[PDB]
Design a protein around this ligand. Structure first.
Ligand SMILES: Nc1ncnc2c1ncn2[C@@H]1O[C@H](COP(=O)(O)OP(=O)(O)NP(=O)(O)O)[C@@H](O)[C@H]1O
Ligand SMILES: O=P(O)(O)O[C@@H]1[C@@H](O)[C@H](O)[C@@H](OP(=O)(O)O)[C@H](OP(=O)(O)O)[C@H]1O
Ligand SMILES: [Mn+2]
Length: 270
């Protein structure tokens, strides 16, 4: 029906406001003119509310009757290469990130991080990639919202192919029509990404695929969250499958989508 951190209710039916960020506004504007137009929420421009700038977006939940939502962060890498430079030259030590790390694996921090009670953001995000499916499969499940109002973010150690398959199995609750529609949509999104002028020219970091379905078997998938999507310099391009090595700006986005399609196709045959 409706999603209502960065989000505020819109006056217009079927819309939602997201706090405006310059990289995301730039990306959504380009995307409305790109092959990927239909694969992302409609962007209607910027509006002012309480002296603050908001993106006016399609409410992706509007068409659905009690939507189930799964957020799937795409890519082998989940931070910008400029974070690695900033961490080397002027590290901003993060005490919060030390605690969240220690909570999962007490042996994960180094002797020096224990002494600092703090880690760098890139170190934290790299660790998060390795205990989840990000490093190996190129995506990870971030969270689910169920039709029963229940929600979960308890997926930080969901890593193996079979562990991911079991989360989707529980998410679709044996609805063969929803799974088939999800797979048809992912196949069409992959085809669109492989021809998109935007996609070949941009490093797509920290974006998600949002899976939405309802008890009426309606099913949609959209790309969201372009806050860390940045253009490559002087007409250089990415293949989005080859391994990341600092300098090459590769994000493994399509490695992730390939594996995600493979897992849902496997689930469909179970
Ligand atoms: N256009 C949309 N319509 C409806 N729901 C949306 C829309 N965009 C985002 N959402 C919901 O809001 C969540 C957060 O979206 P996102 O754009 O990733 O924001 P964020 O502030 O970067 N949050 P996060 O990724 O968790 O750090 C999604 O997982 C959806 O549940
Ligand atoms: O999910 P946990 O383990 O809490 O970690 C979050 C991570 O999920 C999120 O993606 C990061 O934001 P970003 O994607 O804009 O970099 C955030 O950074 P920050 O906003 O704290 O700097 C981390 O703290
Ligand atoms: Mn996000």
């Amino acid at each position: 029906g409706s999603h209502m951190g960065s989000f505020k209710a819109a006056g217009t039916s079927g819309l939602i406001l997201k706090r405006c960020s310059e990289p995301e506004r730039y990306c959504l504007a380009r995307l409305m003119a790109d092959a990927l137009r239909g694969c992302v929420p409609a962007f209607h421009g910027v509006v002012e509310r309480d002296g603050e700038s908001y993106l006016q977006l399609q409410d992706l939940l509007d068409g659905f009757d009690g939507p189930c939502v799964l957020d799937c962060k795409m890519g082998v890498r989940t931070y910008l290469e400029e974070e690695l430079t900033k961490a080397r030259e002027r590290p901003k030590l993060r005490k919060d990130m030390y605690k969240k790390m220690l909570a999962v694996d007490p042996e994960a921090p180094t002797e020096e991080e224990h002494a600092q009670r703090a880690v760098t953001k890139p170190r934290y995000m790299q660790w998060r990639e390795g205990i989840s499916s990000s490093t190996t499969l190129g995506f990870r499940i971030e969270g689910i919202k169920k039709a029963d109002g229940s929600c979960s973010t308890d997926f930080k150690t969901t890593r193996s192919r079979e562990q991911v398959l079991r989360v989707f199995e529980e998410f679709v609750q044996g609805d063969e029509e929803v799974l088939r529609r999800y797979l048809n949509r992912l196949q069409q999104i992959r085809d669109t990404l492989e021809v998109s002028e935007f996609f070949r020219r941009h490093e797509v970091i920290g974006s998600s695929l949002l899976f939405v379905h309802d008890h009426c078997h309606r099913a949609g998938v959209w790309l969201i969250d372009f806050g860390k999507t940045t253009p490559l310099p002087d007409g250089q391009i990415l293949d989005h499958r080859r391994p990341w090595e600092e300098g090459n700006r590769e994000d493994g986005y399509l490695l992730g989508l390939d594996n995600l399609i493979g897992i849902l196709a496997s689930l469909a045959e179970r």
